């Protein structure tokens, strides 16, 4: 006798690969875990600008604490580009560069959290965010974390640059939590038809509204991860993500109230 | 040039096609080129208990004399119970992912205790684990095969079942470390035209590519379907073999490069 | 070889095995660490029933948050029986099976806490429970933890089944804290003279009240750990523990107010 | 049967006598059958400093060439000071247990530093035990002898002193891993009729069973009394040895199988 | 090609050792992270006195919880002297004795925190104090930590006794946070001209007011670490630290309100 | 009953028309701990059953 010892359950014995056999059990829309949460992603390039950009943003965030329950997630920025330069020079694979770039996002989080410490804000770690965010947002009005996901050496291969970066990790968290929204804070007004700081800037036209699918079919650079558009197609809760200019005071506050001040990205989720 | 790659890295978005192409020309370093990642099945092997695990333990102890092994564990029926409870509550795939990791952790602990007297340990090596692999007295480690995505798990197109589980966790380990081989040790001779437990009529498939596998439109598979896409995007592990761990010697022969099960190639 | 280097203390030089020499120093009743705490143990088999049982219990727990300061501890259930079946088939000792079964109690805790995340409830780890429960119950109204104790490979030998399980761990915690009470949430009305779901259920007579010493002299099966009766004999604070049916809405709420809706187990603690 | 055991495990309470009897018939696997657990005394050895620790370190480094050792540390006088302060405040045994663990941690760190240049590590995750014990160059690990019960410590019948301390922590590790022997290395030739430091006419007891030892009604003992009950319920370690570590060669002779000191048998 | 790959920054390329090159970037006085924080250091020798000293201190601390935001840090005491005796007998270096002595400071912290658990006070670990003090002081009114700094095997050589002990670690934290003050709770009235409990206790005279510079040039014993005077010379925020007798109820409360009830130590801070 | 009581006689009248509270306990406040016990449902005094019939 060498049979499989099974636990009686509606998913027992099956592989979970047959979508016809798993649909009766798990094929439903998930619930919202933290429906009152607002997730704000701060771009690493915004943090790279130093006090000239961080100080006004800290003041805006300070005045937002009595209004929203905030999960603030920081990007990586230029320092991740250098560890890519060294890592690619050493030939390291994409799963090696993913945690190296994530470290710079965490350091940006410690910097931002320190500026808000007097308001009761501190940086929290990924296991704390994944399992104990509820208790931490009951203790204080906002916490800071790294926007990068903990994919590490399990990062997807294909490109030598880690695909699941700050925008993608922040959206995965916001949608899994069923949060009230995700706002991406950029160093530009939003998404353009070309790089507004690149070689073809003269033809860049500002896009006030767009769909993730249309941007996924796009060719050329974007201010957000291309993997963000891919996880937006499988989103379950968040219907829109707005990219706003964090260098203009008040736009983050306006975006958190649903006001159109940047580029609105429509996900694959429709209302009910 | 590296000067243009470094220039693009500082002046362009990481989404820029110019940057992506320059990074693709970088050198390719394999961290553990002499090692082999094997997955010991969860539902297919470990859930069978002593009759299946004990022979494979003896085979592993004998095989590590000639091959460096990173031994990943599946989860199995306890994860399916957890998935059923959580899915019935409407919990998202990210929550189910952490639940499944615990089951693979349990299986790694049980396999490691049977291997402890042979020096083979259970590892959570954050920076790899070079010492136990390096030593001829050990030459093997046991790890939990679930990916670390946790709440950041990418959901499937439909449903809350995490699409990346212990098949993808072990494969991405082999790909990241540039291992020479990835062997899935389960309870069937290999891939069949259908689930051999529920279709008496299934035919064994000794060799197939990802494109040919997708064209057949399989309702069920011996491997997680997203792994086929990870295989096609992989830089180091361009093929995998699925072997029957219930037949003594299949793992040892597969480690020596023999074709004893189903070989699934990226191209 | 040369003399012991002692620190001058009332217990210095002592082996601590002589009860006559240790009594003047340590023989007194301990203080209560968290006297306002209420501990609730949710059976693993209750969680095994899925949404049909969890959803009504989550709603009852939601209404209890403004009334009590709750430490919610979850049991293991049927999944621990399977890891026992595999582990015993592999010949693993009892200290190996104890942490494997505890894992299922932890997973049940993560599941239950996720359902209450929107209320500020999160799962907390054993070191957090042992050393930081006070600050966590100051941040939020309730936390969830694993009811199993961290005995691990130091589990007691004798039985091939781990004796210090969810009921025992929950009571050890509640009594060590000096909590106001411990309530055990079961899938049956309480303790019977026989298994009300077993072959002799026709003989099963409900016991509205019992003593731990009378139950410890029994031989038949019980809905609680037999080790629970042992640690009840040496308890210091909790005088009674009620086992109530969590499948009947309102019984947990009633038990937390001292209302008799299940089986009352008298411990060895005493006086007014 | 396994079929009987698996049916009982899923349909009965774990307290059911039928389930308990079926589980007792399961196979018995020893995780580290060739290893020996030794306790280096806290108050009896390590608190004595160089004159006691240095010769035992030399003996351990020599003994590990022939014997695999798990070296557990006692706590000692610093724990008694902590127990005194906490007991004076009325803190429960579970709080005292955590305080005592830190003292045994200190002693493990100090002993491990003296053994670091010999390759012997201080281990404390469970996970670091497999590699160094297998390596003949190492063949030993140091660990802190306090049990992990923490606030979940079972209290004694009277008082707040934790009844399970470094004697029980070392013994239960020997029992769990199926080690071949447990040796307590302290500062007396063995068990006596009474505390030999305070009773001048105490008589040395070379051998005794747990039942006869509990029959004596000893006011004091060289081992924690609850360990006698753990010994009677043990599956693998059915006797313990207590030796005088202040006499050179006593530990080596005990490892060679000589009945140096006192042997306490479960039956 | 072997050139250094630099990230363009105001501190790029330079070694950070040229004080003339680093001053235009980092030469300014830092901000205060937690200006409303009050740090209280409890001497290990105060805890060593047991319930006779701890119970009145706990009652005084209890009444201070609604008045201040407290970071309570505990010293090591006599048990560290024993681990020094054994460690030095074994010949262990100063970097080995430092974490061993720090353990006794942590144990004192767990003891004190347990007495205040019913008030919501818990012991928190050094990484928690270093990165998440703000969120924890938003959850509860006070937290307890070890006053020893995590110098570990990187302790400074020179003395066989670890120099960076409880007083030094407490001040390093308090000044780095920019806290409103640091109060050192001793088993004596303050600093004397000689050890008031030593062989020359008949010569000891009370010093109501001292400066860290004059104390550092002193030779002979002090109730505070000599490294405390060194870090006081480079202090950035805290201008004075008071050493008060914790065996006299009310002195800690008075010192926290700026009342002169012990020895004042003027630091190197004169903001001009 | 006729004769004196430690509670208002009107309390008994409003207990007959009570809608929620099923029992009210009268405890001795001069004995420390009895109020704490009564708030936890422990019987340390006189229990008065109202008109609310429990399920
Ligand atoms: N289509 C586009 N629309 C707008 N900006 C673009 C576009 N393509 C490229 N960019 C450029 O990308 C820049 C933003 O870069 P990026 O998104 O990498 O930084 P970040 O998001 O702050 O960093 P991180 O992702 O590490 O948080 C903008 O300054 C802009 O010049
Ligand atoms: N004397 C008894 N009185 C009542 N129930 C009994 C008795 N003996 C056996 N049982 C059975 O035990 C069952 C409860 O099982 P058990 O206590 O193992 O689950 P649980 O407590 O939810 O799980 P866990 O201990 O992992 O939290 C009841 O359904 C009942 O059928
Ligand atoms: N110049 C001095 N003035 C006052 N006390 C002194 C002086 N020199 C030595 N002492 C002695 O030091 C004692 C305090 O000891 P110490 O500062 O080491 O303990 P502590 O600060 O409570 O412990 P820890 O530093 O571990 O927190 C006093 O009781 C006093 O006898
Ligand atoms: N087309 C197929 N060919 C072969 N096996 C299949 C196929 N479809 C499903 N299977 C089944 O998948 C099982 C292995 O997957 P799974 O149950 O997830 O085990 P594991 O825990 O090892 O992943 C095999 O037992 C086999 O019966
Ligand atoms: N009946 C006895 N026989 C032998 N030794 C005893 C007895 N009773 C007490 N002891 C004492 O117990 C001591 C060992 O226990 P302990 O001081 O706790 O050491 P450790 O810290 O190593 O456990 C010995 O030094 C011995 O003096
Ligand atoms: O058992 Mo899994 O989670 O499908 O690998
Ligand atoms: Mg599978
Ligand atoms: Mg961007
Ligand atoms: Mg002892
Ligand atoms: Mg039960
Ligand atoms: Mg340098
Ligand atoms: Mg001092
Ligand atoms: Mg009255």
Swiss-Prot record, chains A, C, E:
Activity-pH behavior: Optimum pH is 6.5 to 7.0. Above pH 7.1 molybdenum is released.
Record flagged with keyword Oxidoreductase: no
Record carries keyword Cytoplasm: yes
Annotated compartments: Cytoplasm
Keywords: Cytoplasm, Metal-binding, Molybdenum, Storage protein
Swiss-Prot/TrEMBL induction comment: Requires molybdenum.
GO molecular function, one term: nutrient reservoir activity
Gene Ontology terms: cellular component: cytoplasm
Any Pfam family the entry gives: AA_kinase
InterPro entries from the UniProt entry: AceGlu_kinase-like_sf, Asp/Glu/Uridylate_kinase, MoSto_subunit_alpha/beta
Subunit structure: Octamer consisting of 4 alpha and 4 beta chains.
Cited function: Intracellular storage of molybdenum. Binds polyoxomolybdates. Can bind at least 90 molybdenum atoms per protein molecule.
Family: Belongs to the UMP kinase family. Highly divergent.
UniProt protein name: Molybdenum storage protein subunit alpha
Organism from which the protein derives: Azotobacter vinelandii (strain DJ / ATCC BAA-1303)
Gene expressing this chain: mosA
Swiss-Prot record, chains B, D:
Subcellular location: Cytoplasm
Keywords associated with the record: Cytoplasm, Metal-binding, Molybdenum, Storage protein
Presence of the UniProt keyword Transmembrane helix in the record: no
InterPro entries, sorted: AceGlu_kinase-like_sf, Asp/Glu/Uridylate_kinase, MoSto_subunit_alpha/beta
Coiled coil: none
Inducing or repressing factors: Requires molybdenum.
Pfam families: AA_kinase
Activity-pH behavior: Optimum pH is 6.5 to 7.0. Above pH 7.1 molybdenum is released.
GO cellular component: cytoplasm
A GO term, aspect molecular function: nutrient reservoir activity
Origin: domain of life: Bacteria
Biological function: Intracellular storage of molybdenum. Binds polyoxomolybdates. Can bind at least 90 molybdenum atoms per protein molecule.
Family classification: Belongs to the UMP kinase family. Highly divergent.
Subunit composition and interactions: Octamer consisting of 4 alpha and 4 beta chains.
Name this protein carries in UniProt: Molybdenum storage protein subunit beta
From Swiss-Prot, chain F:
Subcellular location: Cytoplasm
UniProt superkingdom: Bacteria
Cleavable signal peptide: none
Induction: Requires molybdenum.
Subunit structure: Octamer consisting of 4 alpha and 4 beta chains.
Function: Intracellular storage of molybdenum. Binds polyoxomolybdates. Can bind at least 90 molybdenum atoms per protein molecule.
Family: Belongs to the UMP kinase family. Highly divergent.
Protein name: Molybdenum storage protein subunit alpha
Organism: Azotobacter vinelandii (strain DJ / ATCC BAA-1303)
Encoding gene, per UniProt annotation: mosA
Segment of the intact protein contained: 222 to 276 of 276
């Amino acid at each position: 006798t060498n049979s499989i010892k099974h636990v009686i359950s509606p998913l027992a014995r099956q592989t979970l690969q047959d979508r016809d056999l798993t649909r009766p059990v798990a094929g439903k829309r998930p619930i919202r875990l933290l429906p009152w949460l607002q997730v704000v992603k701060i771009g690493g390039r915004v943090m790279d600008r130093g006090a000239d950009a961080i100080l006004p943003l800290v003041e805006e965030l300070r005045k937002l604490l009595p209004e929203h329950r905030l999960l603030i997630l920081t990007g990586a920025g230029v320092r991740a580009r250098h560890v890519f330069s060294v890592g690619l020079d050493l030939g390291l694979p994409v799963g090696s560069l993913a945690p190296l770039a994530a470290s710079e996002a965490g350091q940006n989080g410690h910097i931002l959290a320190a500026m808000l410490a007097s308001e009761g804000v501190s940086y929290v770690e990924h296991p704390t965010v994944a399992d104990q965010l509820a208790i931490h947002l009951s203790a204080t009005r906002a916490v800071v974390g790294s926007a990068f996901p903990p994919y590490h050496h399990h990062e997807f291969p294909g490109s030598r640059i880690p695909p699941h970066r700050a925008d993608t990790g922040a959206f995965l968290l916001a949608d899994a939590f069923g949060a009230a929204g995700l706002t991406i804070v950029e160093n530009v007004d939003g998404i353009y038809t070309a790089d507004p700081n690149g070689p073809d800037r003269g033809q860049a036209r500002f896009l006030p509204e767009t769909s993730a699918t249309d941007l996924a079919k796009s060719e050329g650079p974007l201010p957000v991860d291309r993997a963000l558009l891919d996880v937006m197609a499988t989103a379950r809760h968040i219907e829109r993500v707005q990219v706003v200019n964090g260098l203009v005071p008040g736009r983050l506050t306006a975006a958190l109230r649903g006001e159109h001040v940047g580029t609105l990205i429509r996900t694959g989720v429709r209302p009910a | 040039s590296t000067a243009e790659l470094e220039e693009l890295l500082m002046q362009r978005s990481l989404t820029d096609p110019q940057l992506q192409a320059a990074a693709a020309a970088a050198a390719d370093f394999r961290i553990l080129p002499d090692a082999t990642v094997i997955k010991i099945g969860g539902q297919s092997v470990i859930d069978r208990g002593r009759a299946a695990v004990y022979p494979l333990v003896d085979e592993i102890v004998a095989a590590r004399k000639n091959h460096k092994l990173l031994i990943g564990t599946g989860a199995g029926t306890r994860a399916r119970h957890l998935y059923s409870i959580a899915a019935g509550l409407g919990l998202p795939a990210g929550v189910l992912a952490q639940l499944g990791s615990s089951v693979a952790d349990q299986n790694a602990a049980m396999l490691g205790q049977l291997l402890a007297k042979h020096g083979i340990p259970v590892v959570g090596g954050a920076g790899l684990s070079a010492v136990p692999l390096s030593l001829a007295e050990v030459n093997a480690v046991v790890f939990s095969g679930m990916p670390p995505y946790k709440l950041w798990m990418r959901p499937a197109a439909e449903g809350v079942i995490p699409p990346y589980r212990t098949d993808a966790g072990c494969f991405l380990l082999a790909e990241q470390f540039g291992c020479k081989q990835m062997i899935f040790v389960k309870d069937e001779d290999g891939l069949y035209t259908a689930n051999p437990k529920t279709s008496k009529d299934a035919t064994f498939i000794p060799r197939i590519s990802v494109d040919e596998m997708k064209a057949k439109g399989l309702h069920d598979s011996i491997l997680e379907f997203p792994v086929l896409d990870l295989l096609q995007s992989a830089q180091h592990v361009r093929e995998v073999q699925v072997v029957n761990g219930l037949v003594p010697g299949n793992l040892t022969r597969a480690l020596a490069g023999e074709h004893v099960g189903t070989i699934i190639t990226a191209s």
